[PDB]
Design a protein around this ligand. Structure first.
Ligand SMILES: OC[C@H]1O[C@@H](O[C@H]2[C@@H](OC[C@H]3O[C@@H](O[C@H]4[C@H](O)[C@@H](O)[C@H](O)O[C@@H]4CO)[C@H](O)[C@@H](O)[C@@H]3O[C@@H]3O[C@H](CO[C@H]4OC[C@@H](O)[C@H](O)[C@H]4O)[C@@H](O[C@@H]4O[C@H](CO)[C@@H](O)[C@H](O)[C@H]4O)[C@H](O)[C@H]3O)OC[C@@H](O)[C@@H]2O)[C@H](O)[C@@H](O)[C@H]1O
Ligand SMILES: [Cl-]
Length: 372
């Protein structure tokens, strides 16, 4: 008993406003937005250049055409390290954001994120016991505090747990079980609440490879799976060339270069996306388990100039359209990764300072990709 029980006021099970199964819940969602670099930012909510989440932002997200938000959250840095007690002020701040998103009729998914790495980088036997205890303490607290929200609120137990092999996968399964058990033991609406569980590294391939069973649940048909998508790295996030490969500036049929052809994709084009998303359709969607596509986006390269810029941006725009559209086609619910930035190598499509659209052309792609 490393930490005290934070399961202090467990309520009676309450199905009020928790009527939708995972699958029904998932039919209500077709486009999602991440509040990236915000509630997970190390040093505080405003420490990574974004301002505090405001109702105005959430209204803009719903106005702009999204159905749900994913709110990565940091926790470890706000908790007493001897007792694993999380600051009541932080807890009230998270509740406040959840309440506002739901006031804007958004679905909401709250996680524990990388969060300084305590769990996410430590899916190993040596850390399993201490991590299991912290996972339980935090989740008891988190779910207790958020217990009364109806089915607009989902929980996701981890972010991108670094499980690379079967041994690490079994540790990750443990972490997911504790997350389920923690949440359910607090009762109330948390007995029926749709929970979201993460594939190893949220990587499609390693999930297909290593995943086995959902954790056991007292609830019935109340679990989703989660993967992320930044394929191919070279286009989506690569910022410099390495010896092993070059950055892709361009992507998609119609938008490849003929002058600088070395910045066209050598891989990770349309068919591959089709193929990976098919792996998850088979493993989960067709077994009646929706898949959250929790993060995707390809960064802007505004350090380009000229014909180069114009081409890049056309390809970037289509990539988001294609991923949005092909994920939906196969039962994956796509959530755009937005780190708030409007500068180079960033992914913000809103201007957080002004509560306005910065990147209409990418917002258009996600929308056309959902609206079709
Ligand atoms: O200090 C934190 C610590 O973080 C460690 O990396 C881990 C951490 O990444 C944060 C980055 O997350 C990106 O999103 C990821 C998402 O969370 C994952 O789920 C997804 O799989 O992968 C995504 C990868 O893309 C997010 O897009 C990144 O922005 C973020 O990086 C942090 O960004 C902030 C904000 O500014 C930058 O982005 C916005 C731009 O407009 C701007 O131009 C950029 O500079 C950075 O803030 C800065 O902090 C430095 C510190 O000195 C100051 O110099 C600067 O003034 C201040 O603005 C921040 O540094 C950067 O970390 O969480 C996800 C995990 O996967 C990563 O491993 C690093 O290893 C540590 O070294 C350390 O930074
Ligand atoms: Cl390809």
């Amino acid at each position: 008993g490393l930490y005290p029980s934070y399961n202090t006021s467990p309520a009676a099970p309450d199905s009020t406003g928790m009527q939708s199964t995972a699958v029904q819940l998932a039919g209500k969602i077709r486009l999602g937005w991440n509040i990236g670099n915000t509630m997970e930012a190390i040093g505080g909510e405003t420490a990574w250049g974004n301002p505090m989440v405001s109702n105005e932002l959430l209204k803009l997200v719903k106005d702009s055409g999204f159905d749900a938000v994913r709110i990565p959250v940091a926790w470890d840095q706000y908790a007493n390290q001897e007792s694993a007690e999380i600051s009541a002020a932080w807890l009230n701040r998270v509740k406040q954001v959840v309440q506002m998103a739901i006031d804007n009729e958004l679905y909401v998914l709250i996680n524990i994120h990388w969060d300084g790495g305590w769990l996410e980088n430590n899916i190993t036997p040596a850390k399993k016991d201490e991590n299991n205890a912290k996972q339980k303490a935090f989740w008891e607290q988190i779910a207790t505090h958020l217990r009364d929200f109806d089915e607009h609120l989902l929980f996701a137990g981890t972010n991108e747990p670094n499980a690379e092999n079967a041994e690490q996968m079994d540790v990750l399964n443990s972490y997911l079980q504790t997350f389920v058990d923690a949440v359910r033991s607090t009762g109330g609406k948390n007995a029926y609440r749709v929970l979201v569980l993460q594939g190893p590294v949220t990587d499609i391939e390693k999930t297909n490879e290593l995943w086995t069973h959902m954790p056991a649940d007292t609830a019935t048909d109340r679990l989703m799976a989660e993967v992320h998508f930044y394929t191919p790295y070279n286009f989506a996030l690569m910022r410099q060339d390495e010896s092993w490969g070059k950055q892709f500036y361009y992507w998609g049929e119609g938008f490849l270069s003929t002058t600088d052809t070395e910045r066209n994709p050598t891989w990770g084009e349309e068919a591959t996306i089709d193929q990976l998303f098919d792996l998850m359709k088979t493993k989960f969607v067709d077994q009646g388990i929706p898949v959250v596509l929790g993060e995707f986006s390809a960064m802007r390269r505004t350090n380009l100039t000229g014909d180069a810029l114009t081409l890049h941006l056309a390809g970037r725009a289509y990539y988001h359209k294609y991923v949005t559209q092909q994920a939906l086609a196969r039962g994956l619910l796509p959530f755009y990764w937005d780190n708030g930035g409007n500068d180079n190598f960033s992914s913000g499509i809103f201007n957080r300072q002004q509560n306005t659209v910065f990147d209409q052309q990418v917002l258009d792609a996600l929308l056309e990709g959902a609206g079709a």
